[PDB]
């Protein structure tokens, strides 16, 4: 268990309402980490406590190649801290903005890795991520997926276990969440569908600037694909983007296993995905460990109760 002093504070990575994330060096070890620094007042007043704590419990209790690992969690008088694995490759949202579209091979790589992570969270851990999107999907130094931001997760979902909270990101909300229905772990697959649609098609499958119009598209409009899209992809995205979750690929008792079996993923050995044996079709070209070029330019340039049982240190 350690404090604020045991770190150097090098580069800003992102600001939010609730606080900031800074690229840190661990004095004792020389290892680079990302630190989320939450102002306690903002948390309590904006009523973000429950999420903050859910992210704590979720991170502590998860260990996976494509999930951001948590090393320390500690609190000062006025702050809450999360020292986490640094993902210097930046956000998928960054890269895809630059490149417009990824190739199917490339989208399959990220897809497989996301499936690996989501499967683990579902069938072990009994968690539902709920907020899958390009912004929450980062790359490490090698070009492997790291998922961050676990505040909107739900714990204790075991199969058909259904939820009620209306949360996520409007553009990614699954039809059953948009109806005010009870929803199972299959919203994550809807999310996978939208993410992968965006990677292969270069755009959101449903978009209006206006949320209600947007929700109306999501509920009523049937998917359309670019004519250059291969049928294996087309099938996958159809399956994932089914509006009735009971029909959605991943919606049954098989969960991720159903998506893993899809012919879009024919050549993928799922053990090798997990073991990082696969060749990333993009390596982030960071020279130094402090190279923050895949992070947003506006941040990169430097620009109250006690929480019981919040403190935590990673074991062995």
């Amino acid at each position: 268990r350690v404090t604020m002093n045991e770190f150097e504070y090098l580069k800003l990575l992102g600001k939010g309402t609730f606080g900031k994330v800074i690229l840190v060096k661990e004095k004792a070890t020389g290892r680079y980490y990302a630190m989320k620094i939450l102002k306690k007042e903002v948390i309590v007043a904006k009523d973000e406590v429950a999420h903050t704590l859910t992210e704590n419990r979720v991170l502590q209790n998860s260990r996976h190649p494509f999930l951001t690992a948590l090393k320390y969690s500690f609190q000062t008088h006025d702050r809450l801290c999360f020292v986490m694995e640094y993902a210097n490759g930046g956000e998928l949202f960054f890269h895809l903005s630059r490149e417009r579209v990824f190739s199917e091979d490339r989208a399959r790589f990220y897809g497989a890795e996301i499936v690996s992570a989501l499967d683990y969270l579902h069938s072990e851990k009994n968690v539902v991520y709920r907020d899958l999107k390009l912004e929450n999907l980062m790359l490490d130094k090698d070009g492997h997926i790291k998922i961050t931001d676990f505040g909107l997760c739900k714990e204790g979902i075991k199969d058909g276990a259904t939820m009620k909270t209306f949360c996520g990101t409007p553009e990614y909300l699954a039809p059953e969440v948009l109806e005010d229905n009870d929803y199972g772990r299959a919203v994550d697959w809807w999310g996978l569908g939208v993410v992968m649609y965006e990677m292969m098609c270069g755009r959101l499958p449903f978009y209006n600037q206006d949320h209600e119009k947007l929700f109306e598209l999501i509920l009523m409009e049937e998917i359309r694909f670019p004519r250059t899209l291969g049928p294996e992809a087309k099938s996958l995205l159809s399956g994932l983007l089914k509006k009735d979750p009971k029909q959605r690929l991943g919606g049954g008792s098989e969960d991720a296993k159903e998506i893993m079996q899809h012919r879009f993923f024919a050549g993928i050995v799922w053990q090798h995905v997990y073991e990082k044996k696969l060749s990333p079709p993009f390596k982030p070209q960071v020279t130094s460990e402090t190279d923050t070029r895949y992070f947003d330019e506006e941040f990169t340039a430097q620009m109250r109760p006690h929480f019981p049982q919040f403190d935590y240190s990673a074991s062995s």
Binding site: H51, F93, L96, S97, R100, D131, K133, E135, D149, G151, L152, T165, F166, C167, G168, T169, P170, E171, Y172, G202, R203, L204, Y207
Partner: peptide
Amino acid sequence: GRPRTTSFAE
């Protein structure tokens, strides 16, 4: 392409 999105809770 698209603008940056914001996560939310009811």
